[PDB]
Enzyme design. Structure first.
Site, short mmCIF file in Angstrom:
data_model
loop_
_atom_site.label_atom_id
_atom_site.label_comp_id
_atom_site.label_asym_id
_atom_site.label_seq_id
_atom_site.Cartn_x
_atom_site.Cartn_y
_atom_site.Cartn_z
CD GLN A 1 -2.66 -1.50 2.26
OE1 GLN A 1 -2.28 -1.27 3.38
NE2 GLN A 1 -3.79 -2.05 2.01
N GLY B 1 4.05 -11.58 9.48
CA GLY B 1 4.97 -12.61 9.11
C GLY B 1 5.82 -12.26 7.93
CB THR B 2 4.87 -11.32 4.53
OG1 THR B 2 3.90 -12.36 4.55
CG2 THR B 2 5.54 -11.29 3.16
N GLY B 3 6.32 -9.44 6.68
CA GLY B 3 7.06 -8.27 7.00
C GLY B 3 8.08 -8.46 8.06
CB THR C 1 -3.73 -3.98 14.30
OG1 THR C 1 -2.48 -4.20 13.65
CG2 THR C 1 -4.09 -2.56 14.16
CG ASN D 1 0.75 3.40 11.20
OD1 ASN D 1 1.22 4.02 10.27
ND2 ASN D 1 0.68 2.12 11.20
CG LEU E 1 20.15 5.32 -2.35
CD1 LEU E 1 19.64 3.98 -2.76
CD2 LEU E 1 19.10 6.03 -1.64
CD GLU F 1 26.74 11.41 -0.78
OE1 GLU F 1 27.15 12.46 -0.24
OE2 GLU F 1 26.31 11.37 -1.95
N1 LIG Z 1 1.28 2.69 7.76
C1 LIG Z 1 0.58 1.66 7.36
N2 LIG Z 1 0.59 0.55 8.12
C2 LIG Z 1 -0.09 -0.51 7.73
C3 LIG Z 1 -0.82 -0.51 6.59
N3 LIG Z 1 -1.39 -1.70 6.49
C4 LIG Z 1 -1.03 -2.44 7.55
N4 LIG Z 1 -0.24 -1.69 8.34
C5 LIG Z 1 0.42 -2.07 9.57
O1 LIG Z 1 0.84 -3.39 9.42
C6 LIG Z 1 0.87 -4.01 10.66
C7 LIG Z 1 0.53 -5.46 10.44
O2 LIG Z 1 1.37 -5.89 9.42
P1 LIG Z 1 0.78 -6.52 8.10
O3 LIG Z 1 1.27 -5.82 6.88
O4 LIG Z 1 -0.71 -6.54 8.21
O5 LIG Z 1 1.28 -8.01 8.09
P2 LIG Z 1 1.62 -8.62 6.69
O6 LIG Z 1 2.88 -8.01 6.18
O7 LIG Z 1 0.47 -8.39 5.78
O8 LIG Z 1 1.78 -10.17 6.97
P3 LIG Z 1 0.51 -11.08 7.23
O9 LIG Z 1 0.03 -10.89 8.62
O10 LIG Z 1 0.91 -12.50 7.09
O11 LIG Z 1 -0.55 -10.74 6.24
C8 LIG Z 1 -0.12 -3.29 11.52
O12 LIG Z 1 0.47 -2.96 12.75
C9 LIG Z 1 -0.48 -2.05 10.77
O13 LIG Z 1 -0.30 -0.92 11.58
C10 LIG Z 1 -0.83 0.62 5.82
O14 LIG Z 1 -1.46 0.68 4.80
N5 LIG Z 1 -0.13 1.69 6.21
#
Ligand SMILES: Nc1nc2c(ncn2[C@@H]2O[C@H](COP(=O)(O)OP(=O)(O)OP(=O)(O)O)[C@@H](O)[C@H]2O)c(=O)[nH]1
Ligand SMILES: CC(=O)O[C@H]1C(=O)[C@@]2(C)[C@H]([C@H](OC(=O)c3ccccc3)[C@]3(O)C[C@H](OC(=O)[C@H](O)[C@@H](NC(=O)c4ccccc4)c4ccccc4)C(C)=C1C3(C)C)[C@]1(OC(C)=O)CO[C@@H]1C[C@@H]2O
Ligand SMILES: Nc1ncnc2c1ncn2[C@@H]1O[C@H](COP(=O)(O)OP(=O)(O)NP(=O)(O)O)[C@@H](O)[C@H]1O
Ligand SMILES: Nc1nc2c(ncn2[C@@H]2O[C@H](COP(=O)(O)OP(=O)(O)O)[C@@H](O)[C@H]2O)c(=O)[nH]1
Ligand SMILES: [Mg+2]
Ligand SMILES: [Mg+2]
Lengths: 356, 441, 429
Positions: free
Chosen positions: B15, B144-146, B179, B206, B252, B254
């Site tokens: 996003q 997880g992915t993140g 969340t 956020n 990048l 620097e």
């Molecule tokens: N700033 C911002 N944060 C987001 C957004 N969407 C999700 N988040 C943050 O993402 C966090 C959760 O991470 P996710 O991205 O949902 O987890 P994921 O990477 O999708 O991995 P999964 O749980 O397996 O789907 C939350 O704490 C949210 O605050 C967004 O559009 N903008």
């Protein structure tokens, strides 16, 4: 009646292995006589712990050397006398892959461990005390946990590959839990006990992995039943009252980090299960420790077959002992600490034992 | 030329990428179809800049991005959206199952089945890139992915590429708002695996942006779009010195040489000061002094921490638009006079400055005004330790009872993997204390 | 493609499910014949969660219907939405259970579980990636409880890495509808607590209160209650079938809401309900939905959370809304009412948002709570159980079908142990 009996905690430091010599991890663990302390390789917060018994088999020559028969006559022999006083016995191991739990409990062909020594000493010490006053009756049980399932180690299967027949556990209201269908076979002397151990340690699930090629993929529990009559003389018939024993000696599997001893599929599935089991057991130990110090706690015996069948052993009615295994390399630091820390919790746990 | 490979790992990342790529398209002139009508009038130019876009002979501009989520619900919004004709169709979904808020699923069970493909498309891209400066990963501690997939990928890229810059943009968890009841763990473990591979991990949160959007822009009910458009702007300042011309440009390579003293204290915080609405866009001069002072106001940060409870180790100030440098020097001197901004003894310089002549682009439908000049401040401070400590406390309160752990062990993770992690983070906290102690002779 | 295979056993199960299919057909634009008669495109992107394509743009659902008697099966067919089910998935035999768990677990149900498992394996191998199962059944009878629990055992053996969710009408405190509720409930708990991953506990007194003092209906038939259960069933699985800003499949919910493996019993609820005259007097916004969802009058479990503490709560929102509102209001709930939340879990809340709401509302929300108050249910059953088991009240109908008292003692012990787990997190230290 009652007897606040603590769980006697022993620890052992195994020597180097071949791969450990290849990658050359140098000494990190040290015994101050009996106290055990560990040293992060960057001189970081040196840690120290103390235990009721310790063992340093790091090399055959060092002062404070402590070998298989010493472990035996220090912990297992007491428990044999308690098994003769009229109680049940639980000594249980802990460690990681390649750490020596199998070597310390059972052993090898030439250098056998607590199990054959307990059995041999029982038989010799019985035949020394076997007269027409008190008789002696014996039978053996030996089972394994594999992938949450129970399997009988002393039952050879029929001619089809997957015939590994699973059993189920059940809760008797007074006697506590048990296993249904356990071919507890009958024994008289040391030889058939030895044939049973043969068939069991052969039927036990093993596999080749990235740490030891004869790794243990199953928990194993060893319980002999030994009855000795209580010779009453009463108004009527004699010798009916009787004093029983049931043994418990437990050899567990390792924590199995999936990147070092790495595999896909079955060799990874069972690993998960093992770890799950271990986790639950930790909680029990931790919880029981709090139980000794007044805290209001609940012991999750029922989240695993192992901790469920050992319910009357981890607490309950048995003479109790833990044995931990550790290796001398930086590779194991936190694992060792985990190992060590669990023992320090198991030091504090107390159960109530009673004559049978 | 100077080129970058953006990687968007997860929902938050995708996003944010959508925001960013909308903005880059607006800045250069690219329609969502991939076409640049700007050459309709001016022949022989370069505005579809090669740092972020690749050109085919047919006149298209395809991005250098890789999107990855392990769930189709989020990339399919691109594929069936307004930017379907821009991204190469190889946007990676093997997202038959997400990670269930689990680093164990994102690092081992479903950490694999996709990563080889990811590295393949990255390799295809980098081979097309001659002068590659680095990567920019967009992820989120909390999933997880993140959390785990990002870690695995960083591990693999620190081998297959090596002496390249790998910077991150992360949503750091908030102290109150959240969340997910599994965020602490994932955060600690990701920090353990990434501290040895990443080079600078810019952090956002956020809650801070919610509060910014409340005070300054007069939005009491903001959604996620209205947040990421700010984040987008932040990258556009980091990335301007590659795309647009300027006086003092910052590549990048620097940042991490100035904002990172020791290899483990590479957790800087972002801010973007003139987050001002169109009503309040008037009634303001919007000079360098105002903005530079605002970027040091704690209430104008994007990570919920008070710098007054700590010490600044470094600060890079990236200016856009009509800016004369004398004004910067005066502003930084004003800041160095103030006693509420307490710098370390071992950084008597403290500041870095970069300037670019291209002002920011107002996204239509948006909530920010057209400004003549904008400023982005990236600051390495000691306050963030408090934040780290908070997570650690949460961890303890849970790991003392081993809550939620059987989901991790269930997906191939040893219990010890937690402990190690916590210990490492403790070290880091101790390291932060080591850098605040005044030196002695 | 995250797909669900839906089973439903017994009278309650089949009636609820039929009302469910008449609620997820209306959302996805499917008619009683199978055809699409919709408005949007998003109705079809993710229809595969529940349905399968057959031939002519007809959608046949992945419903597996089970009864030990054919009386309930003929009502779904001879009814509104029955001509869309696959007839080969009506697995039903004769020799009803008799409001007896034994006849469903051992005697007559064991003569029919193989059939069901065949239909499953058909409707599970035709799926690209299965997320899990969901059963609608009834603790209180024989067929639902028995045959359902047996099937759970057999699927968690054959399909162990997957979800097994459950929507179960638990028995009620004041008035019953079977005299052997206790036994059957205890044995079903014994066979669920070990096997399932989510158990959503429903209780009909709660739903009658909802239909009385909130919806202000004077004639609350069962079709209305099932219409409340379907509402939750849909809310739980929205984010697998419609897009959103912040998504939540089932496994995520479970991971967040299940700290220890056995405390997976949830009190559900749905908001907003407005009685048809209090519509024009109520604003539709997050504070109102939150005020309703955390009220004890909107929960279906018949257990006051105010007599316990929330281990873990989950909120699945549907509509265009701000996330700040959600986060703020949740933190407000936790802070003002800290006495009803655990201290060793810092944030006890999980959030999900979807973008495509229900057909007639701008906003909708579902709530799943794990609280300690669920003990008040099981505790009662145990009391009932023992008050009978001490005297062998009705056991000869069970022993006669191949059972032993040992199982009864086992089940009692397990349920009491569960009560004890939920107790140790009830007091404030
Ligand atoms: N700033 C911002 N944060 C987001 C957004 N969407 C999700 N988040 C943050 O993402 C966090 C959760 O991470 P996710 O991205 O949902 O987890 P994921 O990477 O999708 O991995 P999964 O749980 O397996 O789907 C939350 O704490 C949210 O605050 C967004 O559009 N903008
Ligand atoms: C004038 C007007 O606003 O009508 C509304 C309405 O006022 C109320 C009463 C509806 C109404 O619901 C009830 O009257 C009701 C009756 C028995 C048991 C439960 C509810 C409504 O019937 C229900 C109906 O709900 C829907 O439209 C959803 O799509 C709903 N649909 C179905 O349940 C459905 C059932 C059978 C066949 C087809 C669809 C839904 C809810 C959850 C998940 C999916 C769909 C709506 C908006 C209304 C009426 C018609 C009055 C409410 O229903 C729901 C679950 O949202 C009750 O509160 C909501 C909103 C309103 O208060
Ligand atoms: N104290 C010791 N001295 C010398 N050799 C030892 C010692 N302990 C173990 N070994 C050797 O180490 C090898 C592997 O040890 P092993 O007993 O298999 O570990 P383990 O307890 O089985 N762990 P696991 O297999 O995961 O359950 C054996 O072949 C032993 O010969
Ligand atoms: N909500 C609801 N509950 C029902 C319905 N039919 C039966 N019940 C409940 O189901 C319980 C009896 O279960 P039953 O359906 O008879 O199981 P079976 O006889 O084995 O098929 C009772 O406690 C009823 O409250 C229904 O249509 N809706
Ligand atoms: Mg072994
Ligand atoms: Mg996601």
């Amino acid at each position: 009646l009652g007897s606040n009996s603590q769980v006697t905690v022993a620890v052992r430091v195994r020597p180097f292995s071949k791969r450990e010599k290849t990658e050359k991890a140098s000494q990190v663990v040290f015994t101050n006589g009996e106290e055990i302390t560990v040293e992060h390789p960057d001189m970081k917060q040196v840690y120290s712990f103390i235990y009721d018994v310790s063992f340093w088999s790091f090399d055959e020559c060092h002062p404070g050397y402590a070998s298989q028969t010493t472990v035996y006559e220090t912990l297992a022999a007491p428990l044999l006398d308690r098994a003769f006083e009229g109680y049940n016995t639980c000594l249980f191991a802990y460690g990681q892959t390649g750490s020596g739990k199998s070597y310390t409990m059972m052993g090898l062909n030439e250098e056998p461990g607590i199990i054959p020594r307990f059995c041999e000493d029982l038989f010799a010490q019985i035949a020394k005390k076997q007269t027409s006053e008190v008789s002696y009756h014996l039978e053996m049980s030996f089972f394994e946990v594999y992938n949450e399932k129970i399997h009988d180690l002393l039952v050879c299967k029929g001619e089809n590959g997957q015939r590994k027949q699973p059993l189920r556990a059940r809760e008797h209201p007074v006697s506590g839990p048990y296993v249904e269908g356990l071919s507890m076979n009958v024994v008289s002397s040391y030889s058939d006990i030895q044939s049973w151990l043969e068939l069991g340690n052969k039927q036990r699930a093993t596999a080749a992995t990235g740490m030891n090629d004869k790794s243990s993929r199953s928990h194993s529990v060893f319980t002999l039943v030994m009855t000795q009559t209580k010779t009453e003389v009463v108004e009527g018939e004699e010798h009916d009252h009787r004093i029983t024993s049931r043994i418990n000696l437990v050899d567990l599997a390792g924590s199995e980090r999936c990147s070092t001893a790495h595999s896909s599929g079955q060799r990874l599935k069972e690993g998960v299960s093992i770890n799950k089991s271990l986790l639950t057991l930790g909680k029990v130990i931790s919880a029981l420790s709090e139980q000794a110090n007044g805290k209001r706690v609940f012991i999750p015996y029922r989240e695993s077959t192992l901790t469920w069948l050992l319910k009357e052993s981890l607490g309950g009615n048995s003479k109790t002992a833990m044995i931990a295994t550790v290796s001398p390399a930086a590779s194991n630091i936190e694992e060792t600490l985990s190992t060590l820390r669990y023992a320090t919790q198991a030091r504090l746990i107390v159960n109530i034992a009673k004559v049978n | 030329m100077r080129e970058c490979i953006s990687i968007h790992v997860g929902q938050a990342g995708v996003q944010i990428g959508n925001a960013c790529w909308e903005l880059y398209c607006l800045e250069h002139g690219i329609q969502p179809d991939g076409q640049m009508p700007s050459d309709k009038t001016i022949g022989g130019g370069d505005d579809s800049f090669n740092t972020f876009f690749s050109e085919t002979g047919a006149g298209k501009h395809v991005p250098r991005a890789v999107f990855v989520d392990l769930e189709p619900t989020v990339i399919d919004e691109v594929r069936t959206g307004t930017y379907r004709q821009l991204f190469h169709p190889e946007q990676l979904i093997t997202g038959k199952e997400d990670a269930a808020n689990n680093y164990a699923r994102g690092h081992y069970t479903i950490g694999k089945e996709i990563i080889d493909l990811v590295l393949d498309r990255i390799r295809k891209l980098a081979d097309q890139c001659t002068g590659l400066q680095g990567f920019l990963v967009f992820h989120s501690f909390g999933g997880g992915t993140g959390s785990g997939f990002t870690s695995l990928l960083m591990e693999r890229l620190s081998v297959d590429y090596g002496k390249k810059s790998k910077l991150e943009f992360s949503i750091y968890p908030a102290p109150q708002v959240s969340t997910a009841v599994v965020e602490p763990y994932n955060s600690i473990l990701t920090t353990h695996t990434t501290l040895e591979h990443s080079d600078c991990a810019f952090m956002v949160d956020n809650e801070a942006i919610y509060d910014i959007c409340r005070r300054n822009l007069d939005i009491e009910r903001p959604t996620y779009t209205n947040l990421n458009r700010l984040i987008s702007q932040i990258v556009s300042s980091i990335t301007a010195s590659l795309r647009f011309d300027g006086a003092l440009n910052v590549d990048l390579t620097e940042f991490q040489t100035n904002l990172v003293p020791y290899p483990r204290i590479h957790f800087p915080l972002a801010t973007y000061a003139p987050v001002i609405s169109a009503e309040k866009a008037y009634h303001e001069q919007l000079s360098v002094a105002e903005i530079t002072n605002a970027c040091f106001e704690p209430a104008n940060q994007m990570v919920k921490c008070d710098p007054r409870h700590g010490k600044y180790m470094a600060c890079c100030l990236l200016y856009r638009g009509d800016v004369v440098p004398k004004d910067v020097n005066a502003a930084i001197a004003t800041i160095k006079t103030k006693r509420s901004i307490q710098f370390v003894d071992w950084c008597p310089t403290g500041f870095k400055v970069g300037i670019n002549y291209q002002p920011p682009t107002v996204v239509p439908g948006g909530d920010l005004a057209k400004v003549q000049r904008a400023v982005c401040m990236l600051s390495n401070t000691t306050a963030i330790a408090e934040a780290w400590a908070r997570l650690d406390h949460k961890f303890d309160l849970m790991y003392a009872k081993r809550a939620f752990v059987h989901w991790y062990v269930g997906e191939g993770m040893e219990e010890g993997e937690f402990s190690e992690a916590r210990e490492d983070m403790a070290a880091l906290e101790k390291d932060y204390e080591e850098v605040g102690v005044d030196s002695v002779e | 493609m995250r797909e669900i295979v839906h089973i439903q056993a017994g009278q309650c199960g089949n009636q609820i499910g039929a009302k469910f299919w008449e609620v997820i057909s209306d959302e996805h634009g499917i008619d009683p014949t199978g055809s699409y008669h919709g408005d949007s495109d998003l109705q079809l992107e993710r229809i595969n969660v529940y349905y399968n394509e057959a031939t002519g743009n007809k959608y046949v659902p992945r419903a597996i219907l089970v009864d030990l008697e054919p009386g309930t099966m003929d009502s779904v067919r001879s009814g509104p939405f029955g001509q869309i089910f696959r007839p080969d998935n009506f697995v039903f035999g004769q020799s009803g259970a008799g409001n007896n768990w034994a006849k469903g677990h051992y005697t007559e149900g064991a003569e029919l579980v193989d059939s069901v498992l065949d239909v499953v394996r058909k409707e599970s191998e035709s799926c690209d990636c299965l997320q899990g199962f969901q059963l609608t059944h009834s603790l209180g009878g024989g067929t639902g409880s028995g045959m359902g629990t047996l099937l759970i055992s057999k699927i968690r053996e054959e399909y162990p890495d997957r979800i097994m969710n459950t929507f179960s009408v638990m028995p009620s405190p004041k008035v019953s509808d079977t005299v052997v509720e206790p036994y059957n409930a205890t044995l079903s708990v014994h066979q669920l607590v070990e096997n399932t991953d989510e158990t959503y506990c429903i209780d009909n007194e709660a739903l009658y209160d909802i239909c009385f003092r909130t919806l202000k209906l004077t004639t609350p038939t069962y079709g209305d209650l099932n219409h409340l259960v379907s509402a939750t069933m849909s809310g739980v699985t929205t984010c697998l079938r419609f897009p959103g800003q912040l998504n939540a499949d089932l496994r995520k919910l479970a991971v967040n809401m299940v700290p220890f493996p056995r405390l997976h019993f949830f009190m559900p609820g749905f908001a907003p309900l407005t009685s048809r005259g209090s519509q024009q007097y109520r604003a539709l916004t997050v504070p109102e939905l939150t005020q309703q969802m955390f009220d004890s009058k909107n929960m279906m479990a018949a257990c006051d959370p105010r007599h316990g503490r929330y281990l873990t709560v989950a909120a699945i929102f549907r509509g265009r809304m701000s996330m700040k509102e959600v986060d703020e209001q949740m933190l407000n709930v936790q802070n003002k009412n800290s006495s009803y939340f655990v201290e060793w879990i810092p944030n006890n809340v999980k959030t999900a948002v979807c973008d495509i709401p229900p057909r007639g509302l701008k906003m909708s929300a579902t709530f799943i709570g794990n609280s300690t108050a669920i003990q008040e249910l099981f505790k009662r059953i145990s009391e009932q159980f023992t008050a009978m088991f001490r005297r062998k009240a009705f056991l000869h109908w069970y022993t006669g079908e191949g059972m032993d008292e040992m199982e009864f003692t086992e089940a009692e012990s397990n349920m009491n142990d569960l009560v004890s787990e939920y107790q140790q997190y009830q007091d404030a230290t």
